[PDB]
Design a protein around this ligand. Structure first.
Ligand SMILES: CCNc1ccc(C#N)cn1
Ligand SMILES: CCNc1ccc(C#N)cn1
Lengths: 412, 412
């Protein structure tokens, strides 16, 4: 038998807000976080908009000196992690610090820092590269700096599974707790790829929406006029905790994490199979891991990136898994509002899945004006839908065919 | 209920050879793979040598058409993975493809490709960034492309824990199999950080040996004249397999993976504590996981980076864990010959640990002319030492204070 894992703290930076409650208020109001990117000449680029974090104040978390040493993606991941640990009320002590670990990941890591140090290198040669370039740019430094700041001595690692990062990070942290390797994990992801290389690199793959005239309408999952994803920035962190540990200290418990599934499509480097066979296997694995029948699912936070092929694969995968129940559940893409936070997508969406359980409401898929051929599910078009939600899934289907599904259930 | 995990296939590119047996021949002969770097002009750099892979032929593995799209770190990870799968004798079928996954990690991933695309962006503009820039550079695409080529549909992920990556990748792949998420995993790491940004970045941190005039003597773990690590390139991959699965198909078993430990130092972004307290915690976790008396440990493949603080912290940790038995075991750093393969270090060193068991020989620590203060263990100075080895430990320690330990033992 395995131990039970619950969520006792959450933290976030998103295009909708500088914390969880601000972000969630935006989600339930159908607000878009997408706008023209500022303080950057994107004249030469095919996409000039995305989901920026607005008004982030790193000196709430770090000294100016420690912030200068760290890429924005690390700053964001530390902000969400500190928020999550504060929200949990956990007291770190000599008696528990060996039982508290971190798994905060990133899809792309420190592209901004790499770009600025390429400039130094090409213009002035190697002797002007910053001394803190390597440790301030590498993906495992959110887990590193968080563990140093809070004295965490448990499992310390970082996933990098592209757009699946935040989902895998939370799932694997849940395994650490369930199998007795930790009692508490801080888990999630962070991303800041809005630099020349990010907008330019996704742009060169023609993966991005180029709807520059109407950025708030660009991200339109399952809409027949969708033309690729919207790049966004931010972070999500959850405090995962063994159930008896949480009860013994009187923790507030948001929800229980009952299932985690993984699969590989083994199909294509960037596109999923048309029928979403891999995503279907992954959801089936997660439900098996939770000991739940597909009929018990009420709400799915889709991957829903606004790509032609990805959006239709998810509809096929949900029809396959859920059969006669596929229309009864509600499925929405909060990327319609947040855009695609890449490695942090699964983390902010796990938080939105937990809050859908707390508040008994399916967030909307905004901009779903004209559902595409076969997109006839309950996709919660336009407006939030209050409803019964006992069991909520959150899916991530990323580059490389790598799939993750989390299953959350109401706790009482 | 927890299943046993064995090693049935291994694969490698290192500075000593283009496969496992050629690399291992070099290890036992005390050969250095370190030389001045030829692939670029390093006259402006403070370090101009490293451990390059010599004469890699990607056309043993992939069409030149597909190779052209992939960072060297991906080509190296795929080559090592293909070697390991062939070495295992495993046949991928519809009956087992859902039960075979991959966890191949990297510390930095496609830095060369990032630098080359940054040069396009700065010199020409975003329109000259390669459409393959993202899928050909991001760390999870060894796992992604390997799954596409071989049809692996099991857990598909990638770790990035800096210099601990390969050890964490193998340990957490072993947990997938041990606890029933997979029956087979291909696990390890790959790295090719020898570009201007990499050599420049580690150079700016003053982390590298600057022994340009005698590169084969630069890597000198525990030697009083050491002056930092040597940067090296390559890959290690192992096929991990559930024991009954291996027995059922008549697999050749090299050794059993009995223990894995993780810990965080929670000390410093880059420096290990002088007492090795985090490394001691990690080794103790691994030995308890393996159900061992510490006196059963015969051979330790140290992290042994050739840094002043790293090498002495490892002696302190080994003396703390093993007490008087610390004088009976043999401990060596194969980085003395290979240099530091960063995210691939733990993968090639796990392979060297398995071969130490197969051949009953402790590899040497070359260049250990004058052991430093307190470096008075059996460090296998200069020459390979045949000896009884039932249990072998492989240690890794990385930036962010992240530690991993693998425990292997002979399989009867
Ligand atoms: C060291 C030679 N071993 C090899 C070569 C090619 C492949 C493939 N594919 C697998 N193993
Ligand atoms: C996250 C490392 N720990 C793990 C991994 C997988 C499983 C399973 N099943 C159990 N523990």
């Amino acid at each position: 038998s395995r131990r039970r894992v619950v969520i006792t703290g959450m933290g976030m930076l998103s295009p909708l807000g500088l914390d969880v409650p601000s972000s969630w208020e935006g989600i339930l109001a159908g607000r878009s976080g997408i706008a023209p990117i500022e303080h950057m000449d994107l004249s030469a680029y095919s996409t000039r908009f995305g989901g920026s974090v607005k008004g982030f104040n790193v000196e709430e978390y770090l000294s100016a000196k420690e912030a200068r040493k760290l890429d924005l993606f690390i700053q964001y991941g530390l902000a969400a992690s500190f928020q999550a640990v504060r929200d949990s009320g956990l007291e770190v002590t000599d008696a528990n610090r060996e039982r508290i670990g971190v798994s905060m990941g990133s899809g792309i890591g420190g592209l901004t820092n790499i770009e600025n140090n390429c400039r130094s290198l090409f213009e002035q040669g190697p002797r002007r590269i910053s001394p803190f370039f390597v440790p301030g740019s590498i993906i495992n430094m959110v887990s590193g700096f968080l563990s140093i700041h809070l004295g965490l001595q448990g499992p310390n690692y970082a996933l990098t599974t592209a757009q699946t990062t935040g989902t895998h990070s939370i799932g694997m942290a849940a395994r650490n707790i369930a199998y007795g390797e930790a009692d508490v994990m801080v888990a999630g992801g962070s991303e800041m790829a809005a630099c020349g290389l990010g907008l330019g690199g996704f742009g060169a793959a023609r993966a991005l929406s180029t709807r520059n005239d109407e950025p708030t309408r660009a991200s339109r999952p399952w809409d027949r006029d969708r033309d690729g994803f919207v790049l966004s920035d931010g972070s999500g962190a959850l405090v995962l905790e063994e159930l008896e540990h949480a009860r013994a200290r009187g923790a507030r418990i948001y929800a229980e994490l009952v299932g985690f599934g993984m699969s590989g499509d083994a199909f294509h480097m960037t596109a999923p199979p048309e029928d979403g066979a891999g995503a279907a296997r992954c959801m089936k694995n997660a439900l098996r891991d939770a000991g739940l029948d597909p009929r018990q699912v009420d709400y799915i936070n889709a991957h829903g990136t606004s790509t032609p092929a990805g959006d239709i694969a998810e509809i096929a995968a949900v029809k396959s898994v859920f059969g006669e129940h596929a229309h009864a559940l509600s499925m929405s893409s909060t990327k319609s509002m947040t855009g695609h936070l890449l490695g942090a997508a699964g983390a902010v969406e796990a938080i939105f899945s937990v809050l859908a359980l707390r508040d008994q409401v399916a967030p909307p898929t905004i901009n779903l004006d004209n559902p595409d051929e076969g997109c006839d599910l309950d996709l919660v078009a336009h407006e939030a839908k209050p409803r019964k939600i006992d069991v909520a899934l959150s899916n991530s289907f990323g580059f490389g065919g790598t799939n993750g599904t989390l299953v959350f259930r109401r706790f009482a």
